[PDB]
Ligand code: BCL
Ligand code: BCL
Ligand SMILES: CC[C@H]1c2cc3[nH]c4c(c3C)C(=O)[C@H](C(=O)OC)c4c3nc(cc4[nH]c(cc(n2)[C@@H]1C)c(C(C)=O)c4C)[C@@H](C)[C@@H]3CCC(=O)OC/C=C(\C)CCC[C@H](C)CCC[C@H](C)CCCC(C)C
């Protein structure tokens with residue numbers, strides 16, 4: 132079935148691979164070659180997870196956990212029950228995410244739109260691969276990666292962080308957080324602004340974008356504009372993920388001590404290091 | 413235990429919220445249709461919401477949604493297969509017929525108005541006090557298509573007055589008439605404006621505007637549709 | 653070309669805004685124009701509206717900030733080199749548990765915290781009032797104020813409601829860069845790890861989800877900006893090919909989609925629920941649940 136306005140856009144073309152071979156839909160879903168790839172990678176991944184479930188011995192969604200190889204294994208392969216499944220599931224997951232992106236690219240070409248969405252999604256993929264591929268490789272073992280389990284992955288977040296003290300002190304992490312918080316602020320504001328204009332007080336006519344600009348100028352003395360706010364939200368959300376990936380790629384590689392102690396470089400600068408008073412003299 | 417009650421209550425709230433939001437996002441495009449325009453049997457588990465009515469400014473009426481959905485234009489496409497879910501091939505030239513990535517919607521054939529009832533978009537020459545404030549001024553540059561042939565020259569910028577942004581370049585062709593090109597589909601360089609989506613021979617085919625100092629929402633859609641469509645449909649002449 | 657930065661800027665006469673029922677006496681003149689900002693958003697700074705509530709809010713806000721800073725200068729021995737060296741380590745701390753909810757603590761050991769907090773309380777609530785009142789004067793809905801209230805809720809819970817219910821101001825957040833992070837860490841340790849608080853986990857899903865949402869939505873609008881997609885209010889009133897292509901991108905990708913109005917409803921709620929769920933999580937911590945790990949083992 133189609134939305135009322137949809138048929139006119141369902142023309143041939145846009146595919147990157149396969150010509151017309153996979154150029155069709157299933158219900159709402161576009162397929163394409165990268166849709167077949169996504170199905171394959173995702174189905175195999177899910178099957179292997181369900182299998183890894185049995186080798187654990189359990190069917191509860193909030194117990195199933197697939198652990199990477201132990202540190203002993205370095206960057207080598209591991210028997211399926213002792214990390215090998217995690218390694219295969221990880222390749223499947225990467226294959227499915229990249230395939231999903233590339234299928235997004237095909238949909239953009241068919242629709243004649245910009246490639247911004249899959250570009251954006253690639254940042255999430257890069258963050259994932261930071262945690263499961265890049266960071267582990269730079270550190271010498273698959274075992275530094277997170278396990279795939281609902282609760283077990285939080286265990287890993289918590290142990291990984293407390294390895295360096297309070298992880299708050301990671302300065303890339305501060306920047307990342309700042310972006311996440313700011314993005315939520317901006318998303319709240321933007322949503323609310325558009326809706327306050329489209330849904331005014333009871334009598335009244337729909338407000339215009341000029342009213343929206345006027346509201347924000349009255350409030351904070353500035354209006355970024357309708358193009359600007361979408362640029363901003365994209366930048367804030369991508370910046371949060373970029374700095375997320377940065378904050379972890381540097382941790383256990385370039386810096387592996389207690390993150391609080393990093394800040395000593397500032398307090399030790401020679402012009403004020405030895406001055407009496409304050410918290411540090 | 414109060415925390416148990418709060419979390420149980422929250423999941424109930426969340427489910428209702430999601431139901432509400434999905435129904436709010438069915439105010440356009442629904443009911444679903446079969447490929448022949450007829451109502452589809454399976455609409456899914458979410459019913460259409462109660463209509464709402466937006467009161468438009470400057471006496472332009474109302475919009476009530478959901479309401480009866482109509483393309484209000486002919487659609488030059490035909491099936492390529494004997495069952496659902498395959499593509500629909502253009503029956504003539506898809507750029508001229510406005511299908512596929514060249515599609516346009518039958519928007520109102522009036523200009524968008526600012527908060528004061530004046531036209532939102534104006535050629536800069538008619539917009540008092542407006543000028544280029546930073547960056548390369550494209551006015552006067554040759555315009556080059558994806559075939560690396562010169563299609564025309566830029567004679568003005570069409571600007572959004574309340575936003576103070578450039579929205580189109582007005583390009584004059586060999587015959588002396590002009591076309592609008594969306595600002596998002598041009599590359600302003602030091603000695604040219606380059607247009608990837610269109611070869612030089614496709615510029616004349618850009619839909620034209622009725623009044624030479626305003627553009628209607630319908631006309632914007634046809635212009636933007638058409639230049640976007642060139643990305644797929646100018647396969648006879650494109651290079652880097 | 654991607655539409656992240658503009659290629660050409662234009663400028664014309666300053667936009668002084670819509671009038672509606674706004675009192676123009678309270679609105680400043682226009683600020684200057686920034687070419688720098690203009691690569692990304694609009695160049696125009698101001699005008700701003702400053703009625704009586706705004707002056708009050710700005711003043712208590714600054715008084716909050718100056719109270720913290722006077723304390724920081726004191727802590728630095730009035731020495732600028734030390735002030736800069738130690739800036740992130742200074743902290744204006746609340747009264748000790750001994751003083752309960754009373755105002756009897758000395759300035760140097762809690763009283764200044766209460767003074768700064770009073771000023772903050774007045775600043776934020778008067779700014780909330782302003783959020784409502786500026787919308788009203790323009791005939792707009794109150795979505796901004798309802799949204800802002802969700803943020804205020806977490807803030808209130810942390811510095812006011814939760815301390816009151818726990819019997820002491822000692823329980824509130826200190827004013828300092830490092831010290832408030834230490835407080836945050838410590839809050840989690842003391843309540844048996846906040847990862848077992850189901851409301852904290854919801855808060856995270858919403859926080860991550862807001863980045864998901866705005867990345868999706870910002871990217872989508874920029875991708876259809878070649879059809880004027882960022883003119884959202886007009887696409888609401890009169891759907892165009894921008895809105896159709898946007899919807900259809902997502903329909904074809906994940907099997908369903910939004911409208912140009914409705915995506916803003918998805919948006920506002922994704923964001924508002926961060927601090928809604930957050931404040932509940934915090935409010936329940938120590939009042940009703942002393943240890944989230946324990947609570948998790950029972951759900952009770
Ligand atoms: C006790 C723990 C430590 C700590 C240790 C850590 C550690 C360790 C890490 C973080 C990371 C982060 N922390 Mg920290 N952190 C702490 C305290 C905090 C606080 C706080 C208020 O106190 C905040 C706000 C944050 C904030 C953050 C973010 C900056 C960052 C997480 C987001 C991210 O990387 O997304 C990136 C997004 C992804 C990885 C998701 C990718 C999704 C993929 C591409 C697609 C999946 C599809 C899915 C399978 C499909 C399912 C199918 C269905 C149909 C849907 N931390 C405490 C002090 N923090 C992480 C980070 O930076 O990671 C890079 C990280 O590893
Ligand atoms: C070691 C630390 C603990 C921990 C301890 C806590 C504690 C404690 C809290 C959180 C809270 C949160 N944590 Mg945690 N957190 C941890 C690990 C994490 C991780 C992770 C990857 O490990 C993540 C992603 C998070 C994520 C989150 C957020 C979802 C949530 C904050 C929402 C928000 O927007 O707040 C930021 C928004 C506000 C504070 C609103 C402020 C609004 C006011 C009105 C603004 C006034 C401005 C003022 C006047 C200044 C003026 C400025 C000028 C105008 C310029 N935490 C670990 C386990 N976390 C909070 C929460 O809700 O928890 C349930 C909270 O209290
Ligand atoms: C970069 C900015 C932010 C962002 C952006 C972003 N995400 C996106 C996109 C964009 C632009 C999309 O276009 C795309 C989309 O389609 O969204 C609806 C996507 C997407 N983001 C998703 C999730 C997601 N994004 C997150 C984060 C973020 N996404 C950022 C904060 C998170 C977090 C923070 O945790 C999650 C969970 C998906 C909904 C969707 C991508 C769907 C996809 O790739 O589908 C194909 C694959 C499958 C259907 C299943 C694969 C199954 C695997 C083979 C097995 C499972 C392995 C896995 C590693 C197990 C993990 C277990 C956990 C308990 C840890």
Ligand SMILES: CC[C@H]1c2cc3[nH]c4c(c3C)C(=O)[C@H](C(=O)OC)c4c3nc(cc4[nH]c(cc(n2)[C@@H]1C)c(C(C)=O)c4C)[C@@H](C)[C@@H]3CCC(=O)OC/C=C(\C)CCC[C@H](C)CCC[C@H](C)CCCC(C)C
Nearest residue numbers: 312315316319713714717775776779799800803923924927
């Ligand atoms: C829904 C959850 C998210 C959210 C939403 C949200 N926040 C909001 C709103 C909304 C909907 C508003 O309407 C409101 C707003 O006005 O935004 C622009 C606000 C707001 N959120 C703010 C901050 C903020 N929000 C945060 C978080 C969040 N806000 C969440 C992620 C955080 C975090 C992450 O910790 C912060 C720090 C403020 C920018 C603004 C509320 C302003 C306020 O209450 O101000 C009081 C007055 C003062 C603070 C003035 C003191 C000045 C400064 C301390 C220093 C100097 C600057 C000064 C202004 C210069 C003056 C010059 C003089 C010479 C005249």
Ligand SMILES: COC(C)(C)C(=O)C/C=C(\C)CC/C=C(\C)CC/C=C(\C)CCCC/C(C)=C/CCC(C)CC/C=C(\C)CCC=C(C)C
Nearest residue numbers: 718720721769770773807808810811812825827828829832
């Ligand atoms: C350069 O030097 C000068 C002097 C010019 C300065 O001005 C410098 C100034 C500084 C260096 C300022 C520094 C400021 C900070 C570092 C501030 C840090 C702020 C935080 C990180 C704050 C975090 C969280 C705050 C919270 C959660 C507060 C909540 C408060 C309340 C809910 C208010 C509660 C009200 C109370 C307790 C009093 C109520 C009493 C009644 C009678 C109603």
Ligand SMILES: CCCCCCCCCCCC[N+](C)(C)[O-]
Nearest residue numbers: 430434455456457458907908909
């Ligand atoms: C985090 C989950 C939020 C997403 C909610 C998903 C519900 C979408 C289902 C819509 C069905 C589409 N139909 C059949 C109406 O087109």
Ligand SMILES: CCCCCCCCCCCC[N+](C)(C)[O-]
Nearest residue numbers: 850852853854857861918921922
């Ligand atoms: C605007 C609606 C978006 C809905 C997204 C909800 C995702 C749920 C994530 C599971 C959280 C689990 N916890 C923390 C309750 O255990």
Ligand SMILES: CCCCCCCCCCCC[N+](C)(C)[O-]
Nearest residue numbers: 157158159160456903906907908
């Ligand atoms: C494992 C839990 C994940 C929950 C999220 C599932 C939401 C998928 C919605 C897809 C709806 C598409 N359909 C079926 C309408 O085409």
Ligand SMILES: CCCCCCCCCCCC
Nearest residue numbers: 426427428429430431432434
């Ligand atoms: C994927 C999660 C879908 C949850 C939606 C359930 C809606 C419940 C109906 C409540 C009737 C008011």
Ligand SMILES: [Fe+3]
Nearest residue numbers: 321325873884
């Ligand atoms: Fe938007």
